[PDB]
Amino acid sequence: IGPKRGSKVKILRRESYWFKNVGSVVAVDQDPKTRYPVVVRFAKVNYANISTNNYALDEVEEVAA
Amino acid sequence: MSHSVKIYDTCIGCTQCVRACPTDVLEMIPWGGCKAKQIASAPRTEDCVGCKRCESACPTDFLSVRVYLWHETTRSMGLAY
Amino acid sequence: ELDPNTPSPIFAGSTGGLLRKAQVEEFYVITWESPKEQIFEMPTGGAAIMREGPNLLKLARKEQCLALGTRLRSKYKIKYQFYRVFPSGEVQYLHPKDGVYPEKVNPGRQGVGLNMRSIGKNVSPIEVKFTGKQPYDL
Ligand SMILES: CCCCCCCCCCCCO[C@H]1O[C@H](CO)[C@@H](O[C@H]2O[C@H](CO)[C@@H](O)[C@H](O)[C@H]2O)[C@H](O)[C@H]1O
Ligand SMILES: CCCCCCCCCCCCO[C@H]1O[C@H](CO)[C@@H](O[C@H]2O[C@H](CO)[C@@H](O)[C@H](O)[C@H]2O)[C@H](O)[C@H]1O
Ligand code: SF4
Ligand code: SF4
Numbered sequence: 001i002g003p004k005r006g007s008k009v010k011i012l013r014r015e016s017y018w019f020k021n022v023g024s025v026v027a028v029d030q031d032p033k034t035r036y037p038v039v040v041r042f043a044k045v046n047y048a049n050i051s052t053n054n055y056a057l058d059e060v061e062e063v064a065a
Numbered sequence: 066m067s068h069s070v071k072i073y074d075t076c077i078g079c080t081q082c083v084r085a086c087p088t089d090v091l092e093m094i095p096w097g098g099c100k101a102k103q104i105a106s107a108p109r110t111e112d113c114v115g116c117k118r119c120e121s122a123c124p125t126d127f128l129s130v131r132v133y134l135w136h137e138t139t140r141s142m143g144l145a146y
Numbered sequence: 147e148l149d150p151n152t153p154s155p156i157f158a159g160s161t162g163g164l165l166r167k168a169q170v171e172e173f174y175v176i177t178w179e180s181p182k183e184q185i186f187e188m189p190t191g192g193a194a195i196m197r198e199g200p201n202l203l204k205l206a207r208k209e210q211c212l213a214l215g216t217r218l219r220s221k222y223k224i225k226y227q228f229y230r231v232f233p234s235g236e237v238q239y240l241h242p243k244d245g246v247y248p249e250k251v252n253p254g255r256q257g258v259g260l261n262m263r264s265i266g267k268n269v270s271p272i273e274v275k276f277t278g279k280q281p282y283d284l
Contacts, residue, residue, distance in 0.1 A: 048116045073260075092248065137280045140172070145167055
């Protein structure tokens with residue numbers, strides 16, 4: 001806590017169910033390393049019975065900001 | 066394609082996730098870093114029929130497979146007999 | 147057959163399994179271990195018993211002969227084992243090969259998962275017109 005970790009993020013890929021909608025996050029990755037970090041989470045479910053997916057900062061367009 | 070339905074996802078972890086599907090899917094082939102580190106989308110698929118039992122469980126987050134193979138043996142449908 | 151009678155997996159009759167197309171083409175068969183004399187469920191509708199030998203029942207087609215597991219592992223046992231019989235020999239060594247239990251690591255074998263480009267924006271439709279000179283035979 002000091003910058004911004006997981007406090008409000010849209011999705012922008014167009015495949016991902018809650019795509020353009022902004023729900024909440026969690027333990028976003030630490031290290032330099034990989035390509036699929038970030039958990040996100042929101043109320044609304046989706047086509048599977050369980051939906052709580054991990055997208056990745058190449059993107060999260062949050063966008064402003 | 067001749068069995069080409071994409072169930073891929075991103076975790077490709079397979080614990081309380083997915084196993085079901087007659088023979089086809091001998092995976093756990095850990096790619097150099099993807100969390101529970103077992104990955105990809107299949108093994109040698111020239112063996113069994115056309116499920117989508119394939120997802121039904123454990124994410125594909127996009128599509129999920131079904132029939133799309135067309136070129137379709139028989140061993141690839143129960144009935145060659 | 148009889149003059150050679152080599153059995154293992156008890157049954158009696160049945161209009162279920164094996165018929166003409168398991169000579170004229172391929173064969174498929176499952177084998178297993180077991181503790182003490184136990185009555186099972188069966189593919190093809192019927193139902194019999196066990197004890198041993200090879201415990202080597204032969205089966206019509208291989209989706210049929212792994213379902214000994216989809217229940218025949220809700221009835222104890224590490225070991226169950228199905229191969230591929232021809233009308234003459236091998237290539238396709240079915241539960242043979244390397245390790246076993248689909249969910250471990252020795253090698254990687256096939257699979258891949260990607261095509262050219264990955265799941266990403268294939269709003270991009272079908273590209274080139276199919277023409278004998280640009281890597282779309284995979
Ligand atoms: C708390 C009091 C008990 C003392 C233990 C200390 C607790 C902290 C250590 C926990 C990790 C120990 O290792 C432990 O990993 C798994 C459960 O976690 C079990 O293993 C299991 O889970 C693996 C993932 O790890 C799976 O791939 C396997 O299918 C399965 O065999 C191990 O059989 C167990 O030994
Ligand atoms: C690269 C992974 C698969 C393809 C894109 C991945 C998903 C989208 C993110 C990629 C964003 C980068 O886009 C990328 O476009 C081209 C592919 O290298 C590069 O384009 C460049 O490629 C080389 C250096 O880079 C040069 O020899 C080329 O003259 C130049 O056009 C861009 O410099 C790069 O920015
Ligand atoms: S998404 Fe399906 S099978 Fe794919 S990696 Fe996970 S469970 Fe494995
Ligand atoms: S989904 Fe396809 S490959 Fe998977 S088990 Fe079913 S048929 Fe086989």
